[PDB]
């Protein structure tokens, strides 16, 4: 199971997204919930960096199914709407692949 731990602060901004684990849907190279979540996360981070002024603090485990995104400018509307979009997307996977990914808020 991929775990998606999301932190929303008192002002409704996403401060933290941690995604950890493997989907375990297929085996490595052909897992589809994995690819789904991988594309959404890497693309959204690419989008934040390529399309906003925001430079989030990023940590991931070289090769281990741990990625941690932490917002610097929580008042950047664009970076925020990008994170909301990312989560709407991972949520959309969760709706049909409940047992492979779980999103937990705060």
């Amino acid at each position: 199971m991929i775990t998606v731990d999301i932190t929303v602060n008192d002002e409704g901004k996403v401060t933290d997204v941690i995604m950890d684990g493997h989907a375990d849907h297929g085996e490595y190279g052909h897992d589809i919930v994995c690819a789904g979540a991988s594309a959404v996360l890497f693309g959204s981070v690419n989008a934040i960096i390529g399309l906003t002024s925001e430079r989030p603090d990023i940590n991931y485990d070289d090769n281990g199914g741990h990625f941690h995104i932490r917002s610097v400018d929580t008042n950047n509307d664009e970076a925020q709407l990008i994170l909301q979009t990312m989560l709407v997307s991972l949520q959309t996977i969760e709706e049909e692949y409940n047992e492979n990914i779980r999103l937990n808020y705060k």
């Binding site: 991929i2 684990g21 493997h22 989907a23 994995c34 690819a35 991988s38 199914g65």
Partner: peptide, 6 residues
């Protein structure tokens, strides 16, 4: 990108 990271 690594499409099998998760």
């Amino acid at each position: 990108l690594n499409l099998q990271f998760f």
